[PDB]
Amino acid sequence: MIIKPRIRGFICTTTHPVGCEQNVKEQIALTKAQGPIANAPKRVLVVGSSSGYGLSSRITAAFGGGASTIGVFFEKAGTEKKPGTAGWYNSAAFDKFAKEEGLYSKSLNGDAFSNEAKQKTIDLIKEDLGQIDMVVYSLASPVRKMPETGEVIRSSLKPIGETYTATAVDTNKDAIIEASVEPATEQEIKDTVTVMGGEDWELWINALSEAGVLADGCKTVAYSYIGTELTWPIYWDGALGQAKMDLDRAATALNEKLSATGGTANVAVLKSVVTQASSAIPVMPLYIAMVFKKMREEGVHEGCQEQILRMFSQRLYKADGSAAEVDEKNRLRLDDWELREDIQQHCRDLWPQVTTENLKDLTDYVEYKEEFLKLFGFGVDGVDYDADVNPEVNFDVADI
């Protein structure tokens, strides 16, 4: 068929299969250009491997470190009459290129929170790789079906205590507005820790030890975010702040466990990036447009690929083998460039002066929307969008 973009606001109900493959191609080319990571792990599991940091995690490990990779995700294949989700083609394109290079690549598609997800992974590891030496926990679901009870829990992006009011950009008018978010209830906060904390991370690690498929010295990392003071009432003091609290607790527990045979567990705090959910909080497109413009000017701008490459080659698996620099809570900090003072101070100074009228001058907002469209495979360069495209695209993936 011929694939349009059906997009109003920041909901895009359409994906472009080749644009997505072209996006994996660019990220792969970027990692290869940095050269092999001498000390990188060889048998890598990525729980949540189909987009954003998870996809770049799988790409770094395979195409920068030469690793065999198993990835877990929940995507929707495309039929002849309906394109699938970006994550489906992202994964399919990964498999294509990894297999073209002789790298092991298997993928499991389903509910990564379910007990069955851990079993099919334990089994699949046992058929070839035998053991895993790194687990990337990069799930980004706002929803968790509890593995014992079937109850469906969703997280909430709300402050705690008081209302959160901030400047924001209105959708599809590009008009500066004031957005408000109500405080979380006592149950919405629990539920956020349940979905976005470290419980399911610990379930993956603990179940994988109890099958023997965790290699001695295995390291595991989960991804988090601290953000600017513009979003402290959600990401630090809000419902999601209690979740990240819980991820710290899990990392401490997991780090003690794997420490037995020399391994580690860390939370990695990553930078602001444009993702399919990033436009949830209303201030985030406004802030991201502004700080991306400054960070481009200072030459410190990065995407998801560069972030995970730097985590690999400048934190976890450094050429000289020296230990990763961590913060006081034993977290890796890859948001160190974005949270530099001259960068943050620039946003602080410009923030009161942003208007509908100077939006495109003070911020890279028109670029923001292009990058957001790039998530679903549109606006990409090596693609003729008038070409017919088959949305049915298969690869080495098994359900459940």
Swiss-Prot record:
Report the InterPro entries cross-referenced here: Eno_Rdtase_FAD-bd_dom, Enoyl-CoA_Rdtase_cat_dom, FabV-like_NADH_b, Trans-2-enoyl-CoA_reductase
State the family named in the UniProt similarity comment for this chain: Belongs to the TER reductase family.
Q: Tell me the route in metabolism or biology where this protein functions.
A: Lipid metabolism; fatty acid biosynthesis
Highest taxon in the source lineage: Bacteria
Q: What class of enzyme is it?
A: oxidoreductase
Task: Extract the PANTHER family matched here.
Answer: ENOYL-[ACYL-CARRIER-PROTEIN] REDUCTASE [NADH] (PTHR37480:SF1)
The protein's assembly and partners:
Monomer.
Q: Where does substrate bind?
A: 225
What GO MF annotations does this protein's record show?
enoyl-[acyl-carrier-protein] reductase (NADH) activity; NAD binding; trans-2-enoyl-CoA reductase (NADH) activity
Plays an important role in discriminating NADH against NADPH (site feature) positions? 75
Record carries keyword NAD: yes
Q: What is this protein called?
A: Enoyl-[acyl-carrier-protein] reductase [NADH]
What parts of the sequence cross the membrane? none
Q: EC?
A: 1.3.1.9
Species: Aliivibrio fischeri (strain ATCC 700601 / ES114)
Keyword vocabulary terms for this entry: Fatty acid biosynthesis, Fatty acid metabolism, Lipid biosynthesis, Lipid metabolism, NAD, Oxidoreductase
Check the UniProt entry and state the signal peptide residues, or none. Answer: none
Catalytic residues, per the record, are: 235 (proton donor)
Q: Which reactions fall under this protein's catalytic activity?
A: a 2,3-saturated acyl-[ACP] + NAD(+) = a (2E)-enoyl-[ACP] + NADH + H(+)
Q: Tell me the organism's taxonomic lineage.
A: Bacteria, Pseudomonadati, Pseudomonadota, Gammaproteobacteria, Vibrionales
Task: Tell me the residue numbers annotated for binding NAD(+).
Answer: 48-53, 74-75, 111-112, 139-140, 244, 273-275
Q: Describe the function of this protein.
A: Involved in the final reduction of the elongation cycle of fatty acid synthesis (FAS II). Catalyzes the reduction of a carbon-carbon double bond in an enoyl moiety that is covalently linked to an acyl carrier protein (ACP).
